[PDB]
Amino acid sequence: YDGRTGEPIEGPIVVGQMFIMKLYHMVEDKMHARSTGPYSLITQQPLG
Amino acid sequence: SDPVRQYLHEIGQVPLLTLEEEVELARKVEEGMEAIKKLSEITGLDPDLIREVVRAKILGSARVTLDPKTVEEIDQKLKSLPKEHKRYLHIAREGEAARQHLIEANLRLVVSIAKKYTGRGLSFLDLIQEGNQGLIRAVEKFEYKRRFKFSTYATWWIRQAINRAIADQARTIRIPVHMVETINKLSRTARQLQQELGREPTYEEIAEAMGPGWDAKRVEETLKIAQEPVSLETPIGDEKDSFYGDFIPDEHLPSPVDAA
C-alpha cells in the first residue's frame, strides 16, 4: 500500500529482509568550501 | 662516462717511484727552493713573485693577475745575471719540474687515503681533490733530510685537508669547525653510552659523560642546532604527485582580508 494515498501499488512488489552496511564515505567528512585562505610559497596560488 | 674510472686511468698512466727516485726528486725540489730564496735575496724581490713568474715560464703560455708582458719582461730582467747566478735559475726550474713530477707520482696516495672517507656528505671526487690540495701542501713542506718516507709526512696533510673539507662543506647551513667536532664527539659519546646502557641514553647521561660544563639543556641545544633541513621536493604519499612544499603556506605577503 502507498502511504501517501492508501491505494495499493498496482502490481505486487518484492519485499524482504536485506543486510545493509554503512560505509566510511560520509558527507560530513567531505563537504568543504573556501572563500579565501592560505596561499602557496612560490606560485602564490591557493593551497590544496 | 664514469669520471672516476677516467681519473683512475689518468692517474695510473703515471708510474710509481722507488726510494732512490723519490729522494732524488725531493733533493732537487729542496735545492730549487734554496735557489729561489737565494735569488730573491740577491735581487731584493719578493720570493713569491719570482716563484710565480718562474713557474709561469715553466708551464708556458697555456697558463694565462700578471700580464704576459710583465712576466716576460721580468724573465728578460733575470737574464742579466753574469755567472754563478743563472745556476740559481736553472736549479729553481729543475726544482719546479721535480715538484710537478712528485705530485703527479704521489696522487695515488691521495686516492688511497681518500677512498675510506666516502659516505660523509662529500662525493669521492671532491675528497680526491681536497686530498690533492693537501698533498701539494705536504710537498711544499717536506724535508727529505730525515730519511722518512714520503707517505709518512704526506698522509697527515692529506687527512687534515680531507677532514677540513668534511667540516666546511658537508652541510647546507654552515656550522663552524669547533661546533662540528663538538657534535661528532657528542655523537660518539652517545653511541658508547647506548652500547653500555643497552638503550638510548637520556640527556642527563650524555651531559654527565661529556664532562664539566655540559648539562642537559646544552646537549639539547647542540642537538637542535645539529639538525639538517629537509627538501621542499620530498615526495608525499605513494603516488608521484605530491611534494612537501604543497603543505607550506606563505606567512609574509598579506592576505586579501588583511589588505582591506
Residue B84, all three cell numbers: 754563478
Identify the sign of the CA torsion A31, A33, A37, A38: positive
Residue in the block written with cell 642537538: B223
Q: By CB neighbour count within 10 A (0-12 exposed, 13-18 middle, 19+ buried), where does B165 fall?
A: buried
- What's the burial of B94, exposed, middle or buried (CB within 10 Å: 0-12/13-18/19+)? middle
Beta-carbon count within 10 A of B61 CB: 10
Name the helix (H) or strand (E) containing A27. helix A27-30
Q: How many CB atoms lie within 10 A of CB B120?
A: 11
Q: Are B203 and B193 in contact (CB under 8 A)?
A: no
Residue of B nearest to A42 (CA): B250
Residues A25 and B236 sit within 8 Å (Cβ to Cβ): no
Method: cryo-EM
- Note which residues in 4-43 of chain A have CB less than 8 A from chain B: 36-42
Among the partner residues A36, A41, A48, nearest to B250 by beta-carbon distance: A41
What nine digits make up the cell of B209? 659523560
Cα–Cα distance for residue pair B73/B67, rounded to 1 Å: 10
Instruction: Provide CB contacts within 8 A for B226, sequence distance 6+.
Output: B175, B183
| B166: CB partners within 8 A, 6+ apart | B117, B120, B121, B122
CB contacts of B248 in chain A (<8 Å) are 40-41
CB contact at 8 A, B208 and B189: no
Put simply, the answer to whether B248 touches A39 (Cβ < 8 Å) is no
B11 contacts B111 by C-beta, under 8 angstroms: yes
**CA distance, residue B255 to nearest chain A CA (Å):** 8
Reduced to 3 states (helix: H, G, I; strand: E, B; else coil), residue B176 is coil
What's the N-to-C CA distance of chain B in angstroms? 59
CB A47 to CB B249 under 8 A? Answer: yes
* Residue A29 host element (H or E): helix A27-30
Q: What type of residue is B111?
A: V
Helices (H), chain B: 3-12, 19-43, 47-59, 68-77, 86-114, 124-140, 150-169, 177-197, 203-210, 216-225, 256-259
DSSP code, position A46: B
Q: How far apart are CA B175 and CA B125, in angstroms?
A: 23
The verdict on B246 touching A (C-beta cutoff 8 Å) is: yes
For residue B249, the distance in angstroms to the closest alpha carbon of chain A comes to 5
Q: Report the alpha-carbon distance of residue B246 to residue B236 in Å, rounded.
A: 9
B62 CB-near residues (< 8 Å, 6+ apart): none
